[PDB]
Amino acid sequence: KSAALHIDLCKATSPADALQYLLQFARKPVEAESVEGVVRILLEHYYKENDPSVRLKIASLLGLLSKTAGFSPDCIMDDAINILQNEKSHQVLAQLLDTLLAIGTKLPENQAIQMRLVDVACKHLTDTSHGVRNKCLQLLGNLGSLDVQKIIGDYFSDQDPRVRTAAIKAMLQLHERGLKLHQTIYNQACKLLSDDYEQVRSAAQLIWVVSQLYPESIVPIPSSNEEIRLVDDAFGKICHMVSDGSWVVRVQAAKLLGSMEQVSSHFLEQTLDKKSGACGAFVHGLEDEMYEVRIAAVEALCMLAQSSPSFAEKCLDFLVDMFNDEIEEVRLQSIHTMRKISNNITLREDQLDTVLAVLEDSSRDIREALHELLCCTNVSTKEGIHLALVELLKNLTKYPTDRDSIWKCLKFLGSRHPTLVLPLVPELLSTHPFFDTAEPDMDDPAYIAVLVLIFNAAKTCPTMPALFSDHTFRHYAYLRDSLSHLVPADPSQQFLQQSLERVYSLQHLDPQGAQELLEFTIRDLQRLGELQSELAGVADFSATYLRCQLLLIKALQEKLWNVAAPLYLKQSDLASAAAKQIMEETYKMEFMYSGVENKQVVIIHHMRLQAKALQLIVTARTTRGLDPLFGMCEKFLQEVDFFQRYFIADLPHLQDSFVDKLLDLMPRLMTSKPAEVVKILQTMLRQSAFLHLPLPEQIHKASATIIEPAGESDNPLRFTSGLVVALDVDATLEHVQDPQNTVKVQVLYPDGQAQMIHPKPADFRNPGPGRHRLITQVYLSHTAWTEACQVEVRLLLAYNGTIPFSKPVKVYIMPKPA
């Protein structure tokens, strides 16, 4: 209704109320034809109105409309360039240049449009206002590909630093587009490096780009006659630029310096030592006061060492110093880089004792990092290995929880240093020359560690096992069976398919045989799910479906079907409970299991429809008022209509089913009285066929297991009444489609109050595929209790109601009085 917008805009007063009306119109969404109309109305009012701010807002709205995905912005581009030629105000001009950025991003294919945009951009670049110059340079950077480079390069020398930043950003954008750059830009950027301001220097990245593009290019020094490659002079530039006092610029310089790996190592060795102003660049970087600079320097050391091994050997000592760094993150990252570059270097006794020193530290993560380091580190002397083992045993005594990682360390030490270990064998096993040593205590941490080292050393070496005593072989066998990963040296599917085929073929028996076969099959499916965990998904899915079928079958054989409605009594009734259980199991089938396709959802909803029909049948049986029957039947017919419209593409594959027969009789069911329709649908439900459920290609059942309260204990969480005590919650969620939304933690106090909680999406974390960790700190409060009592907590899987999802854990709470 463009007329309403037009008349509302006309009635709106021009100076103030027009701005508010346009803002209100902008916030609400728009449609393609509505855009096509309101753009012309905006342009007409833009011509009519002459205020600066109003025209600025109209230009902003033009930019917003241009970003619309479904619109075809062709004529409005022409009108935009026309008003660009006519525009006077510089702020409104910059807004229209933003609209030109929007249109260029929208339609980057039309070459004629592109050259029109660039020529009008360079025309308006003559304006004195810095903002329009920035916007024009952004357009020039975005629109390119085979003079524009030379034009923007001329603007490098502009007085305004913002324009210079825009120029360098436009160059970076143009490089991102992939155009081949020139070489004259290098000296221009070199001139820019002396600029006082920080953003210009940080952007002038550009010299890194040009160095990467032509690293072998020869460049002459303006003063010195000697020739230097672009790579080396750029390296020196970054080296003496890192001395700048802008820390963001320092981090940028170090990071982009790390990306350079096409330079000779001799120059790096020359410039890294403490004895030109490029000496000790990395010395200054690693000694820098900001840990961000030091981390960036660590990354640069990593990349360069991965390029050059001699530089790595030179710079080991500085990494060792970083292992003494006061910031924990710096230590962790330096250790990781040392691990990354250990493949070629080899340490000395000084390096080894320093490395083992920091391993003593208390924080677990840095110790794990040292463990990762030692797995790959080299070593020359056997005494180095001896020192490593002794310090690792001290670490075992200090922090025994790290025993698995240390055993991995010794595994890698033995495997990578077999020859250097076996001279130390008789001391490590403490074998006496002639005595028979007492059998060492098996299952001890340190002795297992020593044995893991020895055995992994002995995998390649053939002379090692000869020094073993008999109990050493016995312990070898023990460790090998227990720690095989450390110590070195479908009938079911087709069975499930044929069982399901048996059920599908034999469903036509009498009710007794059907019930017996259903019971045997659900028992077999449950046993298969327990026996093999791979098929547990499909097994439990099929078990639930066949249990739904069994519940439906049993309900239809109840006594009440051959007793009149007045004589009915609901105390002995089973059909209502059957319908309820089928409803819950259908919800479980739909939502709990992941990977279910539409072809399973149709049958699940069909079973749900059958359950609803059974509920209608029993409610009609128990009640006597015609009007509730009419209302319930109308609602049920509404559900049938909703189902059949939802799945229009699947009805041919549900032949002889309940919904198919209902559709065949739909007009009669709709017109008939409640008694006739309930009777005919009752006798129809009895004769309904059993649909063949198609097995998914891959399906897993979702499950959670609470572990923070564990199985609980008698110890109650004492705290004052009224106030709140926070309880940690930890669970392992598997195969949950959308855990951050669907999974809800629920706590049940020992009364009707069942409080419910929505964990925030942030706390959910993913350690590995197919699972989800959940860390929650649930808050519980209540009034005073006479003595300690148990409170239940459970996971619920919400959907669009909720269902139980895990074993209900319970914990003891003792809220003390004031």
Partner 1 sequence: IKAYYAGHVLGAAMFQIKVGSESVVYTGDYNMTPDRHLGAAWIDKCRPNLLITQSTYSKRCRERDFLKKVHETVERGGKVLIPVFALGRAQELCILLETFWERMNLKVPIYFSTGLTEKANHYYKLFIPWTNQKIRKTFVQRNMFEFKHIKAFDRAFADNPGPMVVFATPGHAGQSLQIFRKWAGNEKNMVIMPMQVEYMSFSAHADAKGIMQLVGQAEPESVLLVHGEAKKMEFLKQKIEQELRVNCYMPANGETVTLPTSP
Partner 2 sequence: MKLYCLSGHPTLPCNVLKFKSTTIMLDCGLDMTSTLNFLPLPLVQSPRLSNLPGWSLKDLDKELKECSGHVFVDSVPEFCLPETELIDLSTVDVILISNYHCMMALPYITEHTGFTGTVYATEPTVQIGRLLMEELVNFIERVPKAQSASLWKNKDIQRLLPSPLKDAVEVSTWRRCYTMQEVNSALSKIQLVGYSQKIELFGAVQVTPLSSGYALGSSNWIIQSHYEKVSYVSGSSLLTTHPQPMDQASLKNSDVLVLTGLTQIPTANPDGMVGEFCSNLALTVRNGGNVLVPCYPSGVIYDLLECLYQYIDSAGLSSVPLYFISPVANSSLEFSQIFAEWLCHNKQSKVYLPEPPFPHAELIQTNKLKHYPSIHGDFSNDFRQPCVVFTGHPSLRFGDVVHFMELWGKSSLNTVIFTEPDFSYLEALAPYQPLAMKCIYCPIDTRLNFIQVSKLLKEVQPLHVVCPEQYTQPPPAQSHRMDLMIDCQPPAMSYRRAEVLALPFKRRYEKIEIMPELADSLVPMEIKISLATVSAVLHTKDNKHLLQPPPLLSGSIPVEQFVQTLEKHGFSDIKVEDTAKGHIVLLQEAETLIQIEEDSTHIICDNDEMLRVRLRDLVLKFLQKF
Residues that bind partner 1 (CB under 8 A): 196, 243-245, 277, 279-280, 287-291, 317, 321, 324-327, 354, 357, 360-363
Q: What torsion do the CA atoms of 537, 541, 542, 543 make, to the nearest 10 degrees?
A: 100
Q: Is 277 in the site for partner 2 (CB under 8 A)?
A: no
Q: Which does residue 287 bind out of partner 2, partner 1, none, counting CB within 5 to 8 angstroms by kind?
A: partner 1
Q: How far apart are the first and last CA of the chain?
A: 66
Q: Which does residue 187 bind out of partner 2, partner 1, none, counting CB within 5 to 8 angstroms by kind?
A: none
In the chain, the amino acid numbered 360 is: E
Q: Are 208 and 256 in contact (CB under 8 A)?
A: yes
Q: Which does residue 82 bind out of partner 2, partner 1, none, counting CB within 5 to 8 angstroms by kind?
A: none
Query: Please, what is the minimum distance in Å from the beta carbon of residue 286 to partner 1?
Result: 8
Dist. CA 229–CA 15, nearest whole Å = 63
In this complex, which beta carbon is closest to partner 2, that of residue 99 or of residue 615? 99
In this complex, which beta carbon is closest to partner 2, that of residue 92 or of residue 272? 92
In this complex, which beta carbon is closest to partner 2, that of residue 161 or of residue 418? 161
* Other Cβ atoms closer than 10 A to 321: 13
Dist. CA 745–CA 763, nearest whole Å = 13
Q: Which does residue 365 bind out of partner 1, partner 2, none, counting CB within 5 to 8 angstroms by kind?
A: none
Residue 744 phi/psi, 5-degree rounding, is -130, 135
Query: Please, what is the minimum distance in Å from the beta carbon of residue 285 to partner 1?
Result: 12
Q: Which does residue 356 bind out of partner 2, partner 1, none, counting CB within 5 to 8 angstroms by kind?
A: none
Q: Is 290 in the site for partner 2 (CB under 8 A)?
A: no
Q: Are 757 and 787 in contact (CB under 8 A)?
A: no
In this complex, which beta carbon is closest to partner 1, that of residue 240 or of residue 554? 240
Q: Are 612 and 636 in contact (CB under 8 A)?
A: yes
Query: Please, what is the minimum distance in Å from the beta carbon of residue 5 to partner 2?
Result: 15
Q: Is 142 in the site for partner 2 (CB under 8 A)?
A: no
Contact with partner 2 (CB under 8 A): which of 398, 718, 771, 807? Answer: 718
Q: Is 129 in the site for partner 2 (CB under 8 A)?
A: yes
Position of tokens 């300690």?
A: 788
Which range, of 89-97, 103-111, 622-630, 671-679, touches partner 2 by CB under 8 A? 89-97
Q: Is 133 in the site for partner 2 (CB under 8 A)?
A: no
Dist. CA 740–CA 688, nearest whole Å = 40
Query: Please, what is the minimum distance in Å from the beta carbon of residue 810 to partner 1?
Result: 36
Residue 703 phi/psi, 5-degree rounding, is -160, 150
Q: How many residues bind partner 2 (CB under 8 A)?
A: 44
Q: Is 490 exposed, middle or buried (0-12, 13-18, 19+ CB in 10 A)?
A: exposed
In this complex, which beta carbon is closest to partner 2, that of residue 26 or of residue 663? 26
> For residues 751-790, which are near partner 2 according to CB under 8 A?
753, 755-760, 762, 779-781
Which stretches within 647-782 are classed as H helix? 658-664, 666-671, 674-686, 739-742
Q: Which does residue 95 bind out of partner 2, partner 1, none, counting CB within 5 to 8 angstroms by kind?
A: partner 2
> For residues 181-220, which are near partner 2 according to CB under 8 A?
196-197
Query: Please, what is the minimum distance in Å from the beta carbon of residue 320 to partner 1?
Result: 8
Query: Please, what is the minimum distance in Å from the beta carbon of residue 166 to partner 1?
Result: 22
In this complex, which beta carbon is closest to partner 1, that of residue 329 or of residue 584? 329
Long-range CB contact pairs, 669-674, < 8 A, 24+: 669/637, 670/637, 674/620, 674/626, 674/629, 674/630, 674/633
Three-state DSSP state, 145:
coil
Residue 762 per-residue DSSP state = T
Dist. CA 166–CA 174, nearest whole Å = 12
> For residues 14-73, which are near partner 2 according to CB under 8 A?
16, 19-20, 23, 26-27, 52-53, 56-57, 60
In the chain, the amino acid numbered 236 is: G
In this complex, which beta carbon is closest to partner 2, that of residue 19 or of residue 370? 19
Cβ contacts of 718 within 8 Å, gap of 6 or more: 814, 815, 816
Give the helix/strand (H/E) hosting 725. Answer: strand 724-734
Three-state DSSP state, 759:
coil
Q: Is 580 in the site for partner 2 (CB under 8 A)?
A: no
Q: What torsion do the CA atoms of 71, 77, 80, 84 make, to the nearest 10 degrees?
A: 150
Q: Which residues bind partner 2 (CB under 8 A)?
A: 16, 19-20, 23, 26-27, 52-53, 56-57, 60, 91, 94-95, 98, 129-131, 159-162, 196-197, 718-720, 722-726, 753, 755-760, 762, 779-781, 818
